[PDB]
Write a protein that binds this ligand. Structure first.
Ligand SMILES: c1cncc(-c2nc3ccc4ncc(N5CCOCC5)nc4c3o2)c1
Ligand SMILES: c1cncc(-c2nc3ccc4ncc(N5CCOCC5)nc4c3o2)c1
Lengths: 351, 351
């Protein structure tokens, strides 16, 4: 149903299923439709809900009538203050397309980081603290269902610039991981791709997203990607220029069934000398505990939230630089704490 | 057949059909196997042919037993001094893999350009002339069969640093184009992606590779990508920051059936001011005649080879910077000249 309104604006009307709650299709009307993105998956639009005037993203993907949609199924399970809400899905135009209708979120971490790096400055550490902590929160939520995003990268970290709320988005590579069932290795964006994936591992874990997260923290301290690989294997070169060649024991922990890369024995660069001189040590320390070769040695997301780097966040006297209070950082559910319930003592200050 | 040799080296032995010549499967033995690349498709290896000691690349793709391999079919038709030779294909390990055996070529244009940009210098224009001319030669060859590479980019331009010979590679996106059969629009690497592709055009031509080639020339003069889009649609933004908004007549030439991008009316930046001050004008001029919105207005590859920018190449007294003579630049076939045979007078100096 394409019509015009009281003011002659082009209104689209569609029959859409709520994203969460009962499978009960209501009619939905939106206008001001424009393309804000595209990829292999399809197009992303901005539109405005008529009824409420709220802004949304609509991700339009092609749907194999016969195949069921992985991304849809995950989006429908998820409800978290740091994950973008699926409000509705619907279908449209002899091929069938799936449309996901999500909260619009005005900025991303990529676009913010660039503003700074183009002006040769680093994001103040309080912005880095707020963003990383919230990302780890989102990761802990989803990893507690065995869901692994597999494309953690700054362009997929939305933020509201006034509240500093972070919403994880683009579950187009997400997948519930299953011990024993193999996974594609060419996944995740080059720079944020965990080393085991570059080695062809098909039996990895949700700890690949922690690496991805480390690459981002690093990026926000550095002002540029830490591992700027030109190609899939050059990435490994770049990881090695910092971490040095891994032990054989590490290379096993990543992928037991691997192949010959045969690179020169380079020695590990000192961590502190990677970053600029005033870089908070707490930050560099956390960085080190994320960017480990041995996937099982990387912190957990809940573990990462608990790191001393995020102590300033747990200060009662903390405010956003614009004077407003911090978004809800402490209101953990049971599902969120499942991975390690006793960490609640640190993550939840009295106040 | 995995064995050991006279010197105890791990020798792999396989049954492989020559790429060119009669369909006659011979035994082939190679050693010194290592991974030099990977992508969605699979892995790329270096190995050494035992018999001759020659180096090769082996691109391993997964083969749907039922689907036939586009890339294989094209590779087998192609034979050109500026395209990487398929020496052999074979199959290996419940899944079947196709292995393509190609001449090893030590360097690429991407890696050479970067060495320079990292040292804040631009490639001498004679290297830009040699590389661009040879690319256009390769493009003219393949376009004379209606084959369109569809992923022209500097990482896919291999070169021997001593001879300055360029071989085009990665035909993983190539396709014999067919009037009235649609083509996927999300193709080609972002920066080198022709505008009509970003507009969703499924009815494009081998003229998209000329665009891509213009983006490379530009890159080599600039020291960095001319159109550094962060996303699929942002690319269009970046193209527009230079060329300015296209007329409605152009937007039709690219895609008659398009959709709402709704961007600001920006004014064309002067061409000369895009590049640095000493940039030879012939270069900027050629660049302008490649990077046109209207696909039919872009030069042809044979046209491009003819352009005055390449006059220095056609000077009898011309040498490589290393003192040695220039590679074979003039030995055009009939197939190469088919698109416009009379250009032969300029392309083929008396000497
Ligand atoms: C690619 C693949 N799959 C999903 C996504 C995606 N989901 C959303 C949700 C909400 C969004 N809200 C805003 C937005 N703007 C604004 C920030 O810069 C451009 C993207 N983009 C959004 C978006 O993009 C992207
Ligand atoms: C990806 C998709 N389709 C094809 C390929 C591929 N074909 C060749 C041929 C020959 C090659 N020779 C060398 C080489 N090195 C070393 C120097 O350049 C970078 C990779 N890479 C080669 C290559 O890669 C890769």
């Amino acid at each position: 149903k394409v019509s015009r309104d009281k003011d002659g604006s082009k209104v689209t009307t569609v029959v859409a299923t709520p994203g969460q709650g009962p499978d009960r299709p209501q009619e939905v009307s939106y206008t001001d439709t424009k393309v804000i993105g595209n990829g292999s998956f399809g197009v992303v639009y901005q539109a405005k809900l008529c009824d409420s005037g709220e802004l949304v993203a609509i991700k339009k993907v092609l749907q194999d009538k016969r195949f069921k949609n992985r991304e849809l199924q995950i989006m429908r399970k998820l409800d978290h203050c740091n994950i973008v809400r699926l409000r509705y899905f619907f279908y449209s135009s002899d091929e069938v397309y799936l449309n996901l209708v999500l909260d619009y979120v005005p900025e991303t971490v990529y676009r913010v980081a660039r503003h700074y790096s183009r002006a040769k400055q680093t994001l103040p550490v309080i912005y880095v603290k707020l963003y990383m902590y919230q990302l780890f929160r989102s990761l802990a939520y989803i990893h507690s269902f065995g869901i692994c995003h597999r494309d953690i990268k700054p362009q997929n970290l939305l933020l509201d610039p006034d509240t500093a709320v972070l919403k994880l988005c683009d579950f187009g590579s997400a997948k519930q991981l299953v011990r024993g069932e193999p996974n594609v290795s060419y996944i995740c964006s080059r720079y944020y791709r965990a080393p085991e994936l570059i080695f062809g591992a098909t039996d990895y874990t949700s700890s690949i997203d922690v690496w991805s997260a480390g690459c981002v923290l690093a990026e926000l301290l550095l002002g540029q990607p830490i591992f700027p690989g030109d190609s899939g294997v050059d990435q490994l070169v770049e990881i090695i220029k910092v971490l040095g060649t891994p032990t054989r024991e590490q290379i096993r922990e990543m992928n037991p069934n691997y192949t010959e890369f045969k690179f020169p024995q380079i020695k590990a660069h000192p961590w502190t000398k990677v970053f600029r001189p005033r870089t908070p040590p707490e930050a560099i320390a956390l960085c080190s505990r994320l960017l480990e070769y041995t996937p099982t040695a990387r912190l957990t997301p809940l573990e990462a939230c608990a790191h001393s780097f995020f102590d300033e966040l747990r200060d009662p006297n903390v405010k956003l630089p614009n004077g407003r209070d911090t978004p809800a950082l402490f209101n953990f559910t049971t599902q969120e704490l499942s991975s390690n319930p006793p960490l609640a003592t640190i993550l939840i200050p009295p106040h």
